[PDB]
Amino acid sequence: MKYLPQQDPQVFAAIEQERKRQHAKIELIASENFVSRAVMEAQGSVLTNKYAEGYPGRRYYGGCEYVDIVEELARERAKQLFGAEHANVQPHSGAQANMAVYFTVLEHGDTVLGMNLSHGGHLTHGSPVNFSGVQYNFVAYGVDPETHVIDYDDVREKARLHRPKLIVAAASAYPRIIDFAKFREIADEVGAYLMVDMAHIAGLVAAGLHPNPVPYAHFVTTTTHMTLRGPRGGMILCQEQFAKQIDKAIFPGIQGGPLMHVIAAKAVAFGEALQDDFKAYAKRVVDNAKRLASALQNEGFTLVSGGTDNHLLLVDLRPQQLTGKTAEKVLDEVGITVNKNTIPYDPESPFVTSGIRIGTAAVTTRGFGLEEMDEIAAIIGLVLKNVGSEQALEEARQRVAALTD
Amino acid sequence: MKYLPQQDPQVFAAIEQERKRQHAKIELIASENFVSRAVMEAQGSVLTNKYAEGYPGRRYYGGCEYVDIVEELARERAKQLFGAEHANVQPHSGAQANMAVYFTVLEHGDTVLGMNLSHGGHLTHGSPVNFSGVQYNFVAYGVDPETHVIDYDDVREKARLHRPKLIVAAASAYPRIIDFAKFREIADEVGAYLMVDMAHIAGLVAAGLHPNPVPYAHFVTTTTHMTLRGPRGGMILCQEQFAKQIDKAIFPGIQGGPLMHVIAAKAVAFGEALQDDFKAYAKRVVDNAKRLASALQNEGFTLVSGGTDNHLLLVDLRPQQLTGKTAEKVLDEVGITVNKNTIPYDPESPFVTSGIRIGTAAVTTRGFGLEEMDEIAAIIGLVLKNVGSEQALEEARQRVAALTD
Ligand SMILES: Cc1ncc(COP(=O)(O)O)c(CN[C@@H](CO)C(=O)O)c1O
């Protein structure tokens, strides 16, 4: 940076901090990643500078000829990535992407069927403190109590019982492949629309490592920042038939001027995802997650669903008599970042939990491989199995620092 | 840029374009401005990298110690700037800032009283194609047919008649000072809350050139990008009493993870606004707008409300028998960017209009002064008074290029 350090030492110090922290810690928060310098340069550009309400070639302001090129690049690279008929790259976030689909297809009070929030469903899928649960009538389907795999029979009974206008599939804490074909078949049974929120698995979908929801869903929403490793923001994919309504839901519907600099970073991240090495990267993400899961079970940990099909895993800490809140704090003491996360049928409340959610997308980006996964699992074992030992904690800290350089 | 040009020539070319366009054109869109390099460097940082749902010291993720410093800097610089009891610097946009206040104070279907959309009220103030007008019952107050000044008697009658739960003051196309004390007095008369959307005038408010709404309103919303010259995003200011509810409206209410890199650019823009030269700059903005208004009237143009008290002006083109759509296109032909904009009591529809909206915040940022204002008005006169003359247009183009270097 050149001008920031001189103009704002305080903000620059905190940023420099955050940068060093990102390097020093072992980042295991499943929704995180590290973007590339080109993505950051696109967001730090003068595109931040333009009002561009409307869409390419149909703007409400003159002078949009060049930001229209950037948006169309993003839209077209998305279409290439996911095969969707239409993309809207304006959502300011995953939340806004979900909110626009709900604005489009639902009337206030309508019934929506989503994944149980304590089984993997996201906040934007019906939490009662969230707009989604406040505006609409959300009902949930759950995972099997023993396999922790979505119970498709439960999805179907719930759809048939409650007759939702919309069915939402996908999650923020579900370690197994989701069967989009089954959800769509149930939606058609009850005449509901199908929305897939692939935020967590978008990069895996882009790399062919997770079934693509695009051909099954009427709408697909996602963040551009998790496994897709783009800037922080959202995107909606949908069939051509809903194209105009989704675009109008985004604007003049729920947003105003779009973030064109972010939309330029989206196009840049999409370009990266279209390359072969992003595919090699995603592959390592999943390989790494499997490796880490295996290694954690080798250490004596129980995993929700017994393992993972994607970038993430959930540790059930009941066997070690730990709450997720406790494990998260002790791991934070040695430089390992995870999230507490409720486990299906959790006896503890959401603010305490019986599990920790872990993902490998960030460490994979930084170059960690299977041997690092083994080490990280051994570190987690030493810590979580010896919570009151300061020597275990010190040893773990030294082993964390050996990993992060 | 270093990595963008190599990794993504297509996106880099379009960005480089947009940068050159910004320099070559005479940017008169009233909501635009140019941010500083330090603001851009903060948005192009690794802060983009962190999940930070929740607020400083009350996050839902570990590792937020340094992004909490950046957020608290933004919040505290905002509080210093505007004198508000609480700031929420997470709104992703002016739209999201307004949406969170509406989520907080209103139940679906509630009555809200806002400024007539064709008299200066914004889209997020009740447009029927907007979430605001779809979710709630919006009623409007207008400006006087001859002075084009908000009719406070009309505001009061409308409040007393419709008994709104909320009253919204401010606008995207109102060239005169708004009387926040009168709005609050009316709100108290009918027991309504008072929301001031100062997006357009925030920088003028920050510089003491526009009465501050903070002491009169229960809630104040704004974009961080217009006269405030920050990155593109929103902010909500409010009394301490609504602090928790507004924060919860933002999260877990209507958004998800905040844009911490943008929040760092907000703090940087707030730091700039706190300096003396930002005050000198705002002063020039208003001086320039007055100058330009005067000069336009010298050329024979009628201005809505007969002039301006702020950064913006509205030309009523009926005297020249032009629609705003036509004037916007002919000005675009010579390198001058404006917006068509309905004028109060406009005979034309919103897609055609009888006026052009103009502001001086961008050209002032670039250094234009009173002599440039005189020249720009002379250029606009030559063009709009000789629409079918190609020689007038060519002459204007040369005079535009003399201004932009
Ligand atoms: C499946 C899923 N969908 C939407 C979002 C919201 O995205 P924002 O950009 O944050 O609005 C999420 C977010 N997930 C976060 C926690 O909410 C995470 O760490 O998983 C999501 O998971």
Ligand SMILES: Cc1ncc(COP(=O)(O)O)c(CN[C@@H](CO)C(=O)O)c1O
């Ligand atoms: C008064 C006012 N309030 C909110 C907004 C919305 O902000 P976003 O960041 O764009 O969501 C605006 C926006 N004004 C734009 C046109 O909508 C402008 O050019 O005035 C606003 O004016």
